[PDB]
């Protein structure tokens, strides 16, 4: 199917506790493959998946040098944004940035992304045309003016149509045995009595990759969206993910409920009932 590569930057100030920390992590789909942390004893971009370890020295040097330069650019940028919002020197603040590309089954570019947030709120985003900007407020308009004046969008476009797509294709080939393998969920339904009057049906999905999945309960064939307790998809620690959906049912009506599971790794959608 389709694939994505994303880099995630977090820059966090901490007045009175040293200089702002800069963290960067890289993903292909739901698989982290690199990290950088300016707090490390000796900061460098470092491997986090086996298929990246084979890249040579000039790869790691380039990715380390850019990250150290970014450490300083984001420190200056935090100072600028504190100015733009008239903020005190004494408070802690966060810039986040999220950029990358999507490619289709033929490796063709589907679309590019570059969005920034400030203290967890949308700040500025590159538009899908990879040529214009959307600023969330008058402070972000100051950043937009700087970036237009400096022709930033063209630099981002060149990266997103070029290196981003080419390196993603390279990674997908080098890590094909895992990046191009969908693991279907192992599923089952548990039954937790609450009272003589009702019980909980819980539909489980374990060991699946990638994280995207849909679990839904139906009663007499009708989706129970409002009534379904969905837990947030969670990592198992071994690259796989877990999720469950629960519904409270009248005792004796358990067999009118079915759980439905769609996942990329599944030959076809699954339909499960409680099997006592």
């Amino acid at each position: 199917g389709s694939h994505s590569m994303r880099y995630f930057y977090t820059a966090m100030s901490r007045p009175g506790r040293g200089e702002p920390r800069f963290i960067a992590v890289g993903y292909v789909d739901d698989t982290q493959f690199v990290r950088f942390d300016s707090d490390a004893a000796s900061p460098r971009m470092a491997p986090r998946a086996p298929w990246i370890e084979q890249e040579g020295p000039e790869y790691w040097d380039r990715n380390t040098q850019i990250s150290k330069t970014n450490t300083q650019t984001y420190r200056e940028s935090l100072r600028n944004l504190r100015g733009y919002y008239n903020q005190s020197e004494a408070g802690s603040h966060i810039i986040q940035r999220m950029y990358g590309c999507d490619v289709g089954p033929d490796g063709r570019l589907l679309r590019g992304y570059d969005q920034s947030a400030y203290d967890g709120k949308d700040y500025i985003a590159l538009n899908e045309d990879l040529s214009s900007w959307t600023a969330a407020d008058t402070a972000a308009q100051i950043t937009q003016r700087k970036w237009e004046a400096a022709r930033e969008a063209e630099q981002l476009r060149a990266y997103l149509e070029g290196l981003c797509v080419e390196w993603l294709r390279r990674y997908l080939e080098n890590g094909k045995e895992t990046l191009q393998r969908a693991d279907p969920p192992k599923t089952h339904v548990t039954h937790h009595p609450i009272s003589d009057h009702e019980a909980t049906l819980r539909c489980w999905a374990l060991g699946f990759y990638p994280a995207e999945i849909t679990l839904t309960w139906q009663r007499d064939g009708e989706d129970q969206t409002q009534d379904t307790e969905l837990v947030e998809t969670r990592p198992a620690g071994d690259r796989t993910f877990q999720k469950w959906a629960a519904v409270v049912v009248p005792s004796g009506e358990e067999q009118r409920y079915t759980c439905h599971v769609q996942h990329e790794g599944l030959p076809k959608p699954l339909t499960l009932r409680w099997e006592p």
Binding site: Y7, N80, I124, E152, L156
Partner: peptide, 9 residues
């Protein structure tokens, strides 16, 4: 691989 370091905000 990372994008080249760009302009400050």
């Amino acid at each position: 691989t990372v994008r080249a370091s760009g302009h400050s905000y």
